[PDB]
Amino acid sequence: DNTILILGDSLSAAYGLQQEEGWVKLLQDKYDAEQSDIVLINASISGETSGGALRRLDALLEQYEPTHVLIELGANDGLRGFPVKKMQTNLTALVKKSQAANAMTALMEIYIPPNYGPRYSKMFTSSFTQISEDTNAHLMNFFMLDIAGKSDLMQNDSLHPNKKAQPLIRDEMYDSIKKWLNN
Numbered sequence: 001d002n003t004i005l006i007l008g009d010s011l012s013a014a015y016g017l018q019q020e021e022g023w024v025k026l027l028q029d030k031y032d033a034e035q036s037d038i039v040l041i042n043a044s045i046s047g048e049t050s051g052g053a054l055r056r057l058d059a060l061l062e063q064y065e066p067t068h069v070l071i072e073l074g075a076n077d078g079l080r081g082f083p084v085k086k087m088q089t090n091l092t093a094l095v096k097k098s099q100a101a102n103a104m105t106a107l108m109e110i111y112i113p114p115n116y117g118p119r120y121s122k123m124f125t126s127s128f129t130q131i132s133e134d135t136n137a138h139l140m141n142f143f144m145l146d147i148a149g150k151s152d153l154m155q156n157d158s159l160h161p162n163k164k165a166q167p168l169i170r171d172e173m174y175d176s177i178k179k180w181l182n183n
Helices: 023-033 050-064 075-079 084-100 118-135 165-182
Strands: 002-008 038-042 068-072 104-108 138-140
Touching (some): 002 050, 023 165, 068 084, 075 084, 104 118, 138 165
Parallel strands (some): 002 068
């Protein structure tokens, strides 16, 4: 039983693509073809924030009783310049609710452009390390780091990865998930 609830935003919800082209579904295809027992449940919603997810999580945990929760949230809070202290409170509560439901929890590190200056971007990214220290959630590398500088992998809007990016993200997530579940 390695059932992983993916609590993400547009970076995991196949924004601008068909759901079947998105990395979560491509990653399940890979698992299915390699005799894995991992099952991904995608609960990602485009535009989701840390506080919006917090309002949904109790119901998702009751619904699926996942053994693992992988959080990929906060980019929308940071793009909007929301206070990092409040995002940190919200993400910590997400982790603690997941752990209280017996789910092993991972948190993806997120990076944002300096739309509110470099110091806010550092405050924002460092908060994920602080939540991991506070909760013991497993920190995951941001899969966009090696994608966002490649224009052939990004949609016209320069924000969302395109269809070509999805197999690449699938392979980074295969590796990050494998390291977590051996970790």
